[model samples]
Target: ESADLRALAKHLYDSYIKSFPLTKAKARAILTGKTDKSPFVIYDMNSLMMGEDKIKKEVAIRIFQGCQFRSVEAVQEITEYAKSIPGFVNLDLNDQVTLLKYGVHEIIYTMLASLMNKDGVLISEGQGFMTREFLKSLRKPFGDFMEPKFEFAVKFNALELDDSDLAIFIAVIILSGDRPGLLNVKPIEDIQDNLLQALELQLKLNHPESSQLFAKLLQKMTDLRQIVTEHVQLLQVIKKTETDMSLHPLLQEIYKD
Candidate 1:
């Protein structure tokens, strides 16, 4: 049963990657550890030319809007991928929502490393990219919200795992039983355990030169969880400080208790 389950996990992961082929920019980033010289820019100096108050507001809006847009698309992709898993659709609707709500950010942030280079994430579906330095140039609060995730992403990308590895890693994150409000913990935990076992096997098989890579990958999950906690706290701060801002309904549902 364990062997069969692992095979299924690998198959699902392969199918997902095949469906979402990497863009040329991402492929180059993965291969060369370098970003495009003429990459699209999300933050421009023109915004800085505005009046002080207007500039601050514009910067905040740009940062928040860009982040929210990417996050929404990521969550949607994750939902579709979750449905592709063999037994995920059979779970109770509440459990499904619970898992996605709590797990979505962590999984999305984990995969963000894939689109990242040494600098920052490729945004606007590869049309634009943001640099770590450029993000820091934003207002302090907005920059504060993004820095931790970027830090974690840099370290994660250093691992140099390909899409095949990330696919299974995300599956392990989604199936976790430890997520709050789960209705059937045991069954989920059983599945998670199987996924972990399968991930370890794949790591060993694919990364033969790196004996400790599996352990390192597990540690990355711990780092991701901590970063995600900080991310949610930042969202709450954004909500309070920027009262005029409206969070998307999907994001509101995600952060709901």
Candidate 2:
């Protein structure tokens, strides 16, 4: 029954809320509230907001280094989120890595809009807004890496996707069978199909009057693939040039390829 699919989506959605920090719904509450910063740490905003228009290699390295640290944290939550999806845990562990290794960047970028806008992103974890102009000054692979995201972030925010939509969207990205270096891919494909179907059912339940929203979301998911493709190109350059930077083991594993 489609009811079962809706349930699947619901479970996945809630799991994401618990696993990932600053999910869209929660971020809305915090961002709009006159809130306490006790649980959240504000990084990169103070020293950088008044920063120079000129690119300093040291500053750029610090910025990217900070980004990589956050990614390692997100990846752990993403892994835990995937674990709750039906059939996800049973897949070969190697295959799990392959799926996540390729998909993590896309999912990360997708959720990035929660902390962003057309003109800038909320840095300091929603405590401060960082303008695109500041990012662009960082130069080359550093500048180029995030520039497309500034564009992508605004449109995805337009989708008005809540946590439920995002949960299945992220699960589908992880379970994509086409990512390279998978062994025994058919089971993962099956998992993706169920996730896609569940996502469709969940969308209908949430947006009954908007018949095409699911289609629009699927198109957005399609865009994320290419977005990550562009990411791969820039990351490869960053890895080549910043040989000593030593990204997190998991991130280095993905970007190395």
Candidate 3:
């Protein structure tokens, strides 16, 4: 029975892959380190937020130039420069983009998106495909160069999270001090609200399966919320000891603002 189940799962996954050629294309770009042609401007999007004036102005100029180019090679060139700069690594792609929009011209959001593609696939394929050393290889050069006290954030796709009703439970990983980056901004709080809204909308639209998915997402979001709350307390303890002093300034601003 176990063998049959494994076979069935593999078969289903293979079939799904075959049907989703565009998804495969997206995945392939990450594996091969290629840039995508989508014009959405993945990086330097800080203008989306409010009150980041100094950083925003610096990042925005480069972002304007960066966006004008419209090619992956051009973007990669900029990110290479970012790799050489200090105090930028911890910023991650999202944070880097925030700076670049203000006139820094440092990191490229497009290549960052490609890196995210790699990270997401590693999670989906199970951690085995990406070795511990291999993951470190992805982050080390930036660490060695800029030497920022930054760690990668955990990432997940909303589509892959399972429903508790389906007998498949999702586990939240409490990472150590060092872990590879994960991208995707669907926070547990936002997800809980989004899923509830989605459930209601789906019900009105007569999409029962979508409603079921949303219900499952809500459960998973609740589980994540508990984990995040615990982590927040842990962060407080670490902050008290001054493990990372820079975080204090950011946290103060976050609380004050």
Which 10 consecutive residues of model 1 have the lowest summed lDDT?
47-56
Q: Compared with the true structure, what per-residue lDDT tens digits does model 3 show for residues 178-215?
A: 12233433342232343234333433333354546545
- All candidates: TM-score: 0.86, 0.85, 0.28
Candidate 2 per-residue lDDT over residues 115-176, each given as its tens digit:
76665666555555456777777756697667888888888888788888888888888899
- Which residues of candidate 3, in runs, are more than 4 Å off? 1-158, 161-199, 202-211, 241-244, 248-250, 253-257
Q: Tens digits of per-residue lDDT for model 1 on 1-257?
A: 66785686678676666545453336455435464433454454652333223212576676677679768877888888888766677888888888888888998777776666666656545545566667777785786777787788779877878776777888888888888889998778777777787778878778899879999998988898899888888888888888888888898888777
| Comparing 2 and 3 on TM-score, the stronger one | 2
Model 1 quality (TM-score): 0.86
Q: For model 2, where is the 10-residue window of minimal lDDT?
A: 34-43
Best by lDDT: 2
Better of 1 and 3 by lDDT: 1
TM-score of 2: 0.85
